[PDB]
Protein backbone atom coordinates (compact mmCIF):
# COMPACT_ATOMS: atom_id res chain seq x y z
CA UNK A 1 0.00 0.00 0.00
CA UNK A 2 0.92 4.22 -0.70
CA UNK A 3 2.73 6.45 1.56
CA UNK A 4 -0.70 8.43 1.24
CA UNK A 5 -1.73 6.10 3.54
CA UNK A 6 0.76 7.79 6.19
CA UNK A 7 -0.94 11.05 5.85
CA UNK A 8 -1.98 12.57 9.21
CA UNK A 9 -4.15 15.66 8.45
CA UNK A 10 -3.82 19.47 10.04
CA UNK A 11 -6.10 21.74 11.34
CA UNK A 12 -5.10 25.41 12.52
CA UNK A 13 -7.70 26.58 15.59
CA UNK A 14 -9.23 30.00 14.80
CA UNK A 15 -8.74 33.24 17.20
CA UNK A 16 -10.78 33.24 20.21
CA UNK A 17 -13.49 35.87 19.55
CA UNK A 18 -13.60 35.79 15.40
CA UNK A 19 -17.22 35.95 16.34
CA UNK A 20 -17.60 38.75 18.73
CA UNK A 21 -19.84 38.95 21.97
CA UNK A 22 -21.98 40.54 19.80
CA UNK A 23 -23.05 37.84 17.72
CA UNK A 24 -21.26 40.11 15.07
CA UNK A 25 -18.13 38.61 12.44
CA UNK A 26 -16.00 41.18 13.07
CA UNK A 27 -13.29 41.25 10.24
CA UNK A 28 -13.77 38.85 7.63
CA UNK A 29 -11.61 40.58 5.16
CA UNK A 30 -8.93 39.81 7.75
CA UNK A 31 -9.57 36.20 8.47
CA UNK A 32 -9.58 35.65 4.55
CA UNK A 33 -6.09 36.42 3.43
CA UNK A 34 -4.95 34.18 7.02
CA UNK A 35 -7.20 31.70 5.59
CA UNK A 36 -5.77 32.07 2.51
CA UNK A 37 -2.14 31.60 3.68
CA UNK A 38 -3.03 28.16 5.72
CA UNK A 39 -4.76 27.07 2.63
CA UNK A 40 -1.57 27.44 0.65
CA UNK A 41 0.47 26.17 3.17
CA UNK A 42 -1.07 22.97 3.25
CA UNK A 43 -3.62 22.95 5.95
CA UNK A 44 -6.15 20.89 5.80
CA UNK A 45 -9.16 22.48 8.31
CA UNK A 46 -9.63 25.04 11.13
CA UNK A 47 -11.04 24.15 14.55
CA UNK A 48 -14.04 26.99 15.77
CA UNK A 49 -16.03 27.11 19.03
CA UNK A 50 -19.38 27.68 18.49
CA UNK A 51 -20.04 29.76 21.66
CA UNK A 52 -23.39 28.64 23.54
CA UNK A 53 -23.21 32.55 25.24
CA UNK A 54 -22.91 34.21 21.44
CA UNK A 55 -25.85 32.05 20.04
CA UNK A 56 -28.70 31.38 22.83
CA UNK A 57 -28.09 34.95 24.31
CA UNK A 58 -31.40 36.40 24.53
CA UNK A 59 -33.41 33.94 25.91
CA UNK A 60 -34.15 29.77 26.10
CA UNK A 61 -34.64 29.03 22.70
CA UNK A 62 -33.59 32.07 20.74
CA UNK A 63 -30.77 31.04 18.58
CA UNK A 64 -29.05 33.69 16.12
CA UNK A 65 -26.97 31.89 13.90
CA UNK A 66 -26.11 34.14 11.13
CA UNK A 67 -23.06 35.46 12.04
CA UNK A 68 -21.42 32.04 12.24
CA UNK A 69 -23.10 31.15 8.67
CA UNK A 70 -20.92 33.81 7.62
CA UNK A 71 -17.94 32.52 9.26
CA UNK A 72 -18.66 28.57 7.72
CA UNK A 73 -19.14 30.63 3.69
CA UNK A 74 -16.05 32.55 4.48
CA UNK A 75 -13.98 29.04 5.46
CA UNK A 76 -15.87 26.97 2.68
CA UNK A 77 -14.82 29.83 0.44
CA UNK A 78 -11.11 29.25 1.23
CA UNK A 79 -10.65 25.67 0.73
CA UNK A 80 -10.78 24.48 4.03
CA UNK A 81 -12.84 22.21 6.27
CA UNK A 82 -13.92 22.41 9.73
CA UNK A 83 -14.33 21.35 13.38
CA UNK A 84 -16.88 22.72 14.97
CA UNK A 85 -16.92 22.81 19.01
CA UNK A 86 -20.11 22.84 20.68
CA UNK A 87 -18.63 25.28 23.60
CA UNK A 88 -20.88 25.40 26.40
CA UNK A 89 -18.29 27.02 28.92
CA UNK A 90 -17.24 30.69 29.31
CA UNK A 91 -14.54 32.07 27.54
CA UNK A 92 -11.82 34.22 29.87
CA UNK A 93 -10.67 32.45 33.01
CA UNK A 94 -8.42 29.97 31.35
CA UNK A 95 -4.69 30.32 29.94
CA UNK A 96 -5.03 32.16 26.81
CA UNK A 97 -8.18 33.29 26.81
CA UNK A 98 -7.98 36.70 25.41
CA UNK A 99 -11.35 37.65 25.08
CA UNK A 100 -14.35 37.17 27.93
CA UNK A 101 -17.32 35.13 26.81
CA UNK A 102 -19.66 34.29 29.51
CA UNK A 103 -22.31 31.08 29.41
CA UNK A 104 -25.81 32.86 28.26
CA UNK A 105 -26.78 35.80 30.73
CA UNK A 106 -30.38 33.92 31.14
CA UNK A 107 -28.93 31.43 32.16
CA UNK A 108 -26.61 33.56 35.15
CA UNK A 109 -29.62 35.33 35.96
CA UNK A 110 -30.93 31.93 37.23
CA UNK A 111 -27.33 31.14 39.33
CA UNK A 112 -28.41 34.51 40.76
CA UNK A 113 -30.97 32.94 42.52
CA UNK A 114 -29.85 29.47 42.71
CA UNK A 115 -25.51 29.22 43.14
CA UNK A 116 -25.05 25.59 43.44
CA UNK A 117 -25.65 25.34 39.79
CA UNK A 118 -22.01 26.01 39.47
CA UNK A 119 -19.12 23.91 40.70
CA UNK A 120 -18.47 24.77 44.10
CA UNK A 121 -15.26 24.29 46.45
CA UNK A 122 -14.86 23.17 49.66
CA UNK A 123 -14.88 27.15 50.66
CA UNK A 124 -18.08 28.46 48.90
CA UNK A 125 -16.50 29.85 45.51
CA UNK A 126 -18.69 29.58 42.86
CA UNK A 127 -17.20 29.32 39.10
CA UNK A 128 -19.39 30.70 36.93
CA UNK A 129 -17.58 29.35 33.49
CA UNK A 130 -19.81 25.55 33.28
CA UNK A 131 -22.49 24.21 34.74
CA UNK A 132 -22.03 21.78 37.46
CA UNK A 133 -23.09 18.39 36.67
CA UNK A 134 -24.97 18.35 39.09
CA UNK A 135 -27.92 19.58 37.67
CA UNK A 136 -27.82 17.60 34.76
CA UNK A 137 -31.24 15.97 35.19
CA UNK A 138 -32.49 18.75 37.20
CA UNK A 139 -35.66 20.85 35.17
CA UNK A 140 -34.91 23.99 36.76
CA UNK A 141 -33.77 26.16 33.63
CA UNK A 142 -37.11 27.86 32.55
CA UNK A 143 -38.75 24.26 32.32
CA UNK A 144 -35.10 22.20 30.72
CA UNK A 145 -32.55 20.39 32.43
CA UNK A 146 -28.71 21.28 31.71
CA UNK A 147 -28.72 17.98 29.59
CA UNK A 148 -32.07 19.20 27.45
CA UNK A 149 -30.48 22.67 26.83
CA UNK A 150 -27.35 21.43 25.27
CA UNK A 151 -29.61 18.90 23.15
CA UNK A 152 -31.72 21.24 21.92
CA UNK A 153 -28.60 23.37 21.00
CA UNK A 154 -27.04 21.27 18.80
CA UNK A 155 -30.33 19.65 17.18
CA UNK A 156 -30.79 24.20 15.98
CA UNK A 157 -27.43 23.95 15.42
CA UNK A 158 -28.14 20.34 12.89
CA UNK A 159 -30.90 22.03 11.39
CA UNK A 160 -29.99 25.45 10.61
CA UNK A 161 -26.61 24.85 8.93
CA UNK A 162 -27.80 21.66 7.29
CA UNK A 163 -26.43 22.81 3.82
CA UNK A 164 -22.53 23.31 5.66
CA UNK A 165 -23.51 19.65 6.79
CA UNK A 166 -24.28 18.16 3.30
CA UNK A 167 -21.85 19.65 1.54
CA UNK A 168 -19.23 18.17 3.62
CA UNK A 169 -17.94 21.60 4.83
CA UNK A 170 -18.03 20.29 8.82
CA UNK A 171 -16.02 16.64 9.55
CA UNK A 172 -16.18 16.62 13.17
CA UNK A 173 -18.51 18.14 16.29
CA UNK A 174 -16.18 18.55 19.47
CA UNK A 175 -18.51 18.22 22.18
CA UNK A 176 -18.10 20.52 24.72
CA UNK A 177 -18.17 18.61 28.45
CA UNK A 178 -16.73 20.74 30.82
CA UNK A 179 -14.47 24.14 31.66
CA UNK A 180 -12.17 24.88 28.09
CA UNK A 181 -14.59 22.71 26.55
CA UNK A 182 -12.76 19.56 28.03
CA UNK A 183 -14.16 16.37 30.04
CA UNK A 184 -12.98 17.37 33.75
CA UNK A 185 -13.71 19.62 36.34
CA UNK A 186 -12.22 23.02 36.90
CA UNK A 187 -10.11 21.78 39.57
CA UNK A 188 -7.04 24.19 38.79
CA UNK A 189 -9.06 27.74 38.02
CA UNK A 190 -6.50 30.72 37.43
CA UNK A 191 -9.65 32.73 38.06
CA UNK A 192 -9.11 31.78 41.87
CA UNK A 193 -4.95 32.11 42.36
CA UNK A 194 -4.04 28.66 40.93
CA UNK A 195 -0.40 28.63 39.89
CA UNK A 196 0.55 26.17 37.16
CA UNK A 197 2.67 24.08 39.73
CA UNK A 198 -0.26 23.16 42.26
CA UNK A 199 -2.47 20.14 42.83
CA UNK A 200 -5.48 21.96 42.62
CA UNK A 201 -8.86 21.61 44.47
CA UNK A 202 -11.86 19.34 44.36
CA UNK A 203 -15.00 20.40 43.02
CA UNK A 204 -17.94 18.60 43.94
CA UNK A 205 -19.38 21.04 47.25
CA UNK A 206 -22.40 22.18 45.32
CA UNK A 207 -25.35 21.12 46.91
CA UNK A 208 -27.00 18.80 44.28
CA UNK A 209 -23.26 17.08 43.99
CA UNK A 210 -22.94 17.01 47.74
CA UNK A 211 -26.76 15.28 48.59
CA UNK A 212 -26.05 12.39 45.97
CA UNK A 213 -22.39 11.66 47.44
CA UNK A 214 -24.24 11.32 51.03
CA UNK A 215 -27.02 8.93 49.71
CA UNK A 216 -24.46 7.05 47.52
CA UNK A 217 -22.23 6.94 50.94
CA UNK A 218 -25.67 5.67 53.22
CA UNK A 219 -26.22 2.90 50.31
CA UNK A 220 -22.83 2.10 50.64
CA UNK A 221 -23.30 1.64 54.26
CA UNK A 222 -21.22 4.59 55.60
CA UNK A 223 -23.73 6.86 55.84
CA UNK A 224 -21.26 8.76 58.46
CA UNK A 225 -18.66 9.69 55.61
CA UNK A 226 -17.98 13.23 54.14
CA UNK A 227 -16.76 14.91 51.07
CA UNK A 228 -13.21 15.48 51.51
CA UNK A 229 -11.89 17.56 54.11
CA UNK A 230 -7.84 17.11 54.31
CA UNK A 231 -7.24 17.68 50.59
CA UNK A 232 -5.32 20.91 51.12
CA UNK A 233 -6.13 23.96 48.80
CA UNK A 234 -4.98 24.97 45.32
CA UNK A 235 -1.56 25.34 45.13
CA UNK A 236 -0.29 22.78 47.98
CA UNK A 237 2.20 19.85 46.88
CA UNK A 238 0.49 16.70 48.00
CA UNK A 239 2.96 15.45 50.43
CA UNK A 240 1.27 18.48 52.22
CA UNK A 241 -2.11 17.15 52.72
CA UNK A 242 -3.69 14.68 54.59
CA UNK A 243 -5.47 13.30 51.18
CA UNK A 244 -2.69 12.73 49.27
CA UNK A 245 0.47 12.29 51.35
CA UNK A 246 1.52 8.31 51.52
CA UNK A 247 -1.29 6.32 53.53
CA UNK A 248 -3.33 8.93 53.38
CA UNK A 249 -6.82 9.44 52.95
CA UNK A 250 -6.80 8.36 49.03
CA UNK A 251 -5.61 4.94 49.74
CA UNK A 252 -8.98 4.60 52.37
CA UNK A 253 -12.01 2.71 51.76
CA UNK A 254 -13.72 6.42 51.53
CA UNK A 255 -10.96 7.93 49.71
CA UNK A 256 -11.50 5.05 46.87
CA UNK A 257 -15.17 5.33 47.26
CA UNK A 258 -15.21 9.05 46.81
CA UNK A 259 -12.69 8.52 44.30
CA UNK A 260 -14.96 6.61 41.82
CA UNK A 261 -17.64 8.74 42.88
CA UNK A 262 -16.33 11.83 41.19
CA UNK A 263 -14.49 10.05 38.21
CA UNK A 264 -18.19 8.42 37.48
CA UNK A 265 -19.96 11.51 37.49
CA UNK A 266 -17.76 12.45 34.23
CA UNK A 267 -18.11 9.49 32.76
CA UNK A 268 -21.69 9.30 33.09
CA UNK A 269 -21.80 13.14 32.25
CA UNK A 270 -20.01 12.76 29.05
CA UNK A 271 -21.86 9.71 28.05
CA UNK A 272 -25.44 11.23 28.32
CA UNK A 273 -24.18 14.39 26.86
CA UNK A 274 -22.92 11.81 23.83
CA UNK A 275 -26.10 10.04 23.56
CA UNK A 276 -28.07 13.55 22.74
CA UNK A 277 -25.61 14.51 20.47
CA UNK A 278 -25.64 11.08 18.31
CA UNK A 279 -29.39 12.01 17.95
CA UNK A 280 -29.18 14.84 17.23
CA UNK A 281 -26.14 14.10 13.93
CA UNK A 282 -27.57 11.12 13.07
CA UNK A 283 -27.45 10.43 9.44
CA UNK A 284 -25.13 13.30 9.10
CA UNK A 285 -21.25 12.97 7.40
CA UNK A 286 -19.35 13.57 10.62
CA UNK A 287 -17.61 12.56 13.43
CA UNK A 288 -18.56 13.28 16.97
CA UNK A 289 -15.43 14.00 19.39
CA UNK A 290 -14.93 15.35 23.31
CA UNK A 291 -10.89 16.85 24.74
CA UNK A 292 -9.72 15.31 27.24
CA UNK A 293 -7.19 17.22 28.87
CA UNK A 294 -3.36 16.61 29.41
CA UNK A 295 -2.99 16.66 33.31
CA UNK A 296 1.10 15.86 33.45
CA UNK A 297 2.08 17.15 36.15
CA UNK A 298 2.14 14.94 39.80
CA UNK A 299 2.08 12.08 37.10
CA UNK A 300 5.12 10.92 38.51
CA UNK A 301 4.17 10.16 42.23
CA UNK A 302 2.08 8.02 42.92
CA UNK A 303 -0.92 10.29 44.32
CA UNK A 304 -1.57 11.24 40.63
CA UNK A 305 -3.01 14.64 42.67
CA UNK A 306 -3.31 16.78 39.92
CA UNK A 307 -5.37 14.30 37.95
CA UNK A 308 -7.40 12.79 41.23
CA UNK A 309 -8.94 16.49 41.58
CA UNK A 310 -9.73 16.97 38.31
CA UNK A 311 -11.49 14.06 37.94
CA UNK A 312 -9.01 11.46 36.02
CA UNK A 313 -9.09 8.30 38.67
CA UNK A 314 -5.75 7.58 37.14
CA UNK A 315 -2.87 6.19 39.44
CA UNK A 316 0.15 3.62 38.64
CA UNK A 317 -2.66 0.40 39.59
CA UNK A 318 -5.89 2.14 37.92
CA UNK A 319 -5.79 3.16 34.14
CA UNK A 320 -8.45 6.21 34.69
CA UNK A 321 -7.94 6.97 30.64
CA UNK A 322 -8.94 3.92 28.71
CA UNK A 323 -12.50 3.78 30.16
CA UNK A 324 -13.32 7.36 29.10
CA UNK A 325 -12.12 5.71 25.45
CA UNK A 326 -14.31 2.56 25.94
CA UNK A 327 -17.42 4.77 27.14
CA UNK A 328 -16.25 6.55 23.46
CA UNK A 329 -16.57 3.46 21.48
CA UNK A 330 -20.77 2.96 21.67
CA UNK A 331 -20.55 6.38 20.35
CA UNK A 332 -17.64 5.25 17.30
CA UNK A 333 -16.22 8.98 18.72
CA UNK A 334 -12.70 10.17 19.36
CA UNK A 335 -10.77 11.05 22.06
CA UNK A 336 -9.34 14.38 21.44
CA UNK A 337 -5.78 15.04 23.90
CA UNK A 338 -5.32 17.98 24.17
CA UNK A 339 -1.56 18.03 25.13
CA UNK A 340 0.97 16.52 22.67
CA UNK A 341 3.63 18.27 22.45
CA UNK A 342 5.82 18.47 25.44
CA UNK A 343 8.80 17.06 26.61
CA UNK A 344 9.31 15.88 29.99
CA UNK A 345 12.86 17.69 30.18
CA UNK A 346 11.00 20.84 29.76
CA UNK A 347 9.09 21.15 32.96
CA UNK A 348 10.48 22.43 36.43
CA UNK A 349 11.55 18.93 38.53
CA UNK A 350 9.24 19.72 41.17
CA UNK A 351 5.83 19.56 38.94
CA UNK A 352 6.79 15.88 38.90
CA UNK A 353 6.00 16.03 35.21
CA UNK A 354 5.41 12.93 32.91
CA UNK A 355 3.95 14.46 29.46
CA UNK A 356 5.36 12.18 27.43
CA UNK A 357 4.24 9.07 29.54
CA UNK A 358 0.81 10.50 30.41
CA UNK A 359 0.74 11.03 26.13
CA UNK A 360 1.33 7.17 25.78
CA UNK A 361 -0.59 6.04 28.26
CA UNK A 362 -4.08 7.83 26.98
CA UNK A 363 -2.94 7.01 23.18
CA UNK A 364 -2.42 3.67 23.31
CA UNK A 365 -5.64 3.53 25.62
CA UNK A 366 -7.44 4.86 22.65
CA UNK A 367 -5.89 2.54 20.09
CA UNK A 368 -6.33 -0.68 22.74
CA UNK A 369 -9.87 0.20 22.74
CA UNK A 370 -10.02 0.52 19.04
CA UNK A 371 -11.18 3.94 18.69
CA UNK A 372 -9.81 7.02 17.14
CA UNK A 373 -7.45 9.26 18.88
CA UNK A 374 -6.41 13.04 17.54
CA UNK A 375 -4.74 15.52 19.89
CA UNK A 376 -3.78 19.22 19.77
CA UNK A 377 -0.55 21.54 21.29
CA UNK A 378 -1.56 22.57 24.33
CA UNK A 379 0.42 25.82 24.62
CA UNK A 380 1.85 27.95 21.64
CA UNK A 381 4.42 26.70 19.81
CA UNK A 382 6.70 27.34 16.87
CA UNK A 383 10.25 25.65 17.48
CA UNK A 384 11.17 22.60 15.61
CA UNK A 385 11.19 20.82 18.87
CA UNK A 386 7.70 21.52 19.53
CA UNK A 387 6.56 20.34 16.22
CA UNK A 388 8.89 16.84 16.08
CA UNK A 389 7.23 16.19 19.20
CA UNK A 390 4.15 16.26 17.61
CA UNK A 391 5.17 14.31 14.87
CA UNK A 392 6.56 11.72 17.18
CA UNK A 393 2.92 11.65 18.77
CA UNK A 394 1.09 11.36 15.29
CA UNK A 395 2.83 8.69 14.13
CA UNK A 396 4.82 6.35 16.97
CA UNK A 397 6.18 3.97 14.82
CA UNK A 398 7.42 5.55 12.17
CA UNK A 399 6.42 5.80 8.69
CA UNK A 400 5.35 2.76 6.72
CA UNK A 401 6.77 2.89 3.26
CA UNK A 402 4.55 -0.34 2.01
CA UNK A 403 1.60 0.08 3.59
CA UNK A 404 -0.11 2.20 6.42
CA UNK A 405 1.11 2.57 9.58
CA UNK A 406 0.50 0.44 13.18
CA UNK A 407 -0.64 3.31 15.06
CA UNK A 408 -1.36 6.60 13.86
CA UNK A 409 -3.54 9.58 14.46
CA UNK A 410 -6.63 10.44 13.27
CA UNK A 411 -5.76 14.00 13.41
CA UNK A 412 -3.75 17.12 14.93
CA UNK A 413 -5.31 20.55 15.47
CA UNK A 414 -2.48 23.03 15.88
CA UNK A 415 -2.63 25.79 18.65
CA UNK A 416 -4.42 29.15 17.22
CA UNK A 417 -3.73 31.07 13.90
CA UNK A 418 -2.03 34.24 15.06
CA UNK A 419 0.13 37.06 13.77
CA UNK A 420 2.83 34.95 15.01
CA UNK A 421 2.40 31.73 13.73
CA UNK A 422 2.41 34.19 10.39
CA UNK A 423 5.53 35.71 10.69
CA UNK A 424 8.12 34.84 7.66
CA UNK A 425 10.55 32.46 9.85
CA UNK A 426 7.47 31.09 11.99
CA UNK A 427 5.60 30.44 9.26
CA UNK A 428 8.22 28.80 7.66
CA UNK A 429 8.84 25.83 10.27
CA UNK A 430 5.01 25.64 10.07
CA UNK A 431 4.70 25.09 6.31
CA UNK A 432 7.41 21.74 7.44
CA UNK A 433 5.59 20.56 9.86
CA UNK A 434 2.55 20.56 7.62
CA UNK A 435 4.57 18.54 5.43
CA UNK A 436 6.27 16.33 7.64
CA UNK A 437 2.53 15.26 9.36
CA UNK A 438 1.29 14.81 5.59
CA UNK A 439 4.35 12.34 5.44
CA UNK A 440 6.14 13.97 2.82
CA UNK A 441 3.13 14.35 0.45
CA UNK A 442 1.24 17.34 -0.91
CA UNK A 443 -2.23 18.26 0.40
CA UNK A 444 -4.40 16.02 -0.43
CA UNK A 445 -8.31 16.97 -0.64
CA UNK A 446 -10.17 13.73 -1.12
CA UNK A 447 -9.46 11.85 2.45
CA UNK A 448 -10.84 8.73 1.26
CA UNK A 449 -7.49 8.18 -0.69
CA UNK A 450 -5.93 8.50 3.06
CA UNK A 451 -8.40 6.23 4.50
CA UNK A 452 -10.99 9.40 6.09
CA UNK A 453 -14.16 8.79 4.38
CA UNK A 454 -16.63 10.25 6.43
CA UNK A 455 -19.50 8.03 6.52
CA UNK A 456 -23.46 9.02 8.17
CA UNK A 457 -23.34 9.01 11.69
CA UNK A 458 -25.13 5.84 12.76
CA UNK A 459 -27.01 5.78 15.89
CA UNK A 460 -25.01 4.74 19.45
CA UNK A 461 -24.57 1.60 20.53
CA UNK A 462 -26.06 0.18 23.28
CA UNK A 463 -25.09 1.49 27.12
CA UNK A 464 -22.17 -0.27 28.04
CA UNK A 465 -22.83 -0.93 32.05
CA UNK A 466 -20.44 1.11 34.68
CA UNK A 467 -18.97 -2.22 35.75
CA UNK A 468 -17.80 -3.18 32.29
CA UNK A 469 -16.47 0.34 31.56
CA UNK A 470 -14.68 -0.19 34.82
CA UNK A 471 -12.86 -3.08 33.63
CA UNK A 472 -10.90 -0.68 31.59
CA UNK A 473 -9.06 0.33 34.51
CA UNK A 474 -6.91 -2.48 34.48
CA UNK A 475 -3.45 -1.75 33.66
CA UNK A 476 -1.64 -2.39 30.42
CA UNK A 477 1.76 -1.62 29.05
CA UNK A 478 1.85 0.96 26.36
CA UNK A 479 2.87 0.27 22.59
CA UNK A 480 6.17 1.28 21.87
CA UNK A 481 7.51 4.52 20.72
CA UNK A 482 10.41 5.33 18.25
CA UNK A 483 12.65 7.79 20.57
CA UNK A 484 12.30 10.24 17.76
CA UNK A 485 10.08 10.95 14.94
CA UNK A 486 11.20 9.22 11.55
CA UNK A 487 10.00 12.60 10.24
CA UNK A 488 11.71 15.67 11.57
CA UNK A 489 11.44 19.05 10.44
CA UNK A 490 15.32 20.03 10.34
O1 LIG B 1 -10.43 27.47 20.98
C1 LIG B 1 -10.48 26.19 21.65
C2 LIG B 1 -10.29 26.16 23.17
O2 LIG B 1 -9.05 26.79 23.39
C3 LIG B 1 -8.69 27.07 24.79
O3 LIG B 1 -8.59 25.73 25.46
C4 LIG B 1 -7.55 24.91 25.01
C5 LIG B 1 -6.34 25.10 25.94
O4 LIG B 1 -5.83 26.42 25.91
C6 LIG B 1 -5.27 24.05 25.63
O5 LIG B 1 -4.21 24.14 26.51
C7 LIG B 1 -5.92 22.72 25.88
O6 LIG B 1 -6.20 22.28 27.56
C8 LIG B 1 -5.56 21.81 28.77
C9 LIG B 1 -4.17 21.09 28.58
O7 LIG B 1 -4.30 19.81 27.99
C10 LIG B 1 -3.46 20.83 29.93
O8 LIG B 1 -2.11 20.47 29.67
C11 LIG B 1 -3.47 22.07 30.84
O9 LIG B 1 -2.38 23.06 30.31
C12 LIG B 1 -1.47 23.37 31.37
C13 LIG B 1 -0.05 23.08 30.93
O10 LIG B 1 0.16 21.71 30.71
C14 LIG B 1 0.95 23.62 31.90
O11 LIG B 1 2.23 23.38 31.43
C15 LIG B 1 0.71 25.06 31.88
O12 LIG B 1 1.84 25.82 32.23
O13 LIG B 1 -0.49 25.25 32.62
C16 LIG B 1 -1.61 24.83 31.77
C17 LIG B 1 -2.91 25.01 32.51
O14 LIG B 1 -3.38 26.33 32.56
O15 LIG B 1 -4.77 22.67 30.91
C18 LIG B 1 -5.34 23.06 29.63
C19 LIG B 1 -6.67 23.70 29.87
O16 LIG B 1 -7.56 22.92 30.60
O17 LIG B 1 -6.91 22.62 24.87
C20 LIG B 1 -8.01 23.49 25.20
C21 LIG B 1 -9.18 23.16 24.31
O18 LIG B 1 -8.93 23.20 22.94
C22 LIG B 1 -9.78 27.91 25.46
O19 LIG B 1 -9.55 28.19 26.85
C23 LIG B 1 -11.10 27.21 25.28
O20 LIG B 1 -12.09 27.97 25.88
C24 LIG B 1 -11.40 26.97 23.81
O21 LIG B 1 -12.62 26.25 23.73
Redesign the pocket.
Known amino acids: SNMLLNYVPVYV??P?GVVNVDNVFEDPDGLKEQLLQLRAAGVDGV???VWWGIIELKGPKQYDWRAYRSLFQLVQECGLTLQA?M?F????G????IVNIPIPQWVLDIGESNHDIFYTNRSGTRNKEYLTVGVDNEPIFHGRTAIEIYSDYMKSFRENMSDFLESGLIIDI?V?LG????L?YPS?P?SQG?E?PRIGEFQCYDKYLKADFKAAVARAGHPEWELPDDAGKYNDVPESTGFFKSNGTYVTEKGKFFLTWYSNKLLNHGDQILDEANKAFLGCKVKLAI???????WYKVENHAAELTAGYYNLNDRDGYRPIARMLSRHHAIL????LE?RDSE?PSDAK?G?QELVQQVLSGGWREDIRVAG????PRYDATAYNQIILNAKPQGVNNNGPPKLSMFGV?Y??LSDDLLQKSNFNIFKKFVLKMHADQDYCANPQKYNHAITPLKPSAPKIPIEVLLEATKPTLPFPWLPETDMKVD
Open positions: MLLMVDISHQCGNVGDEGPAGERYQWFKVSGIHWNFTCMQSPENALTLR
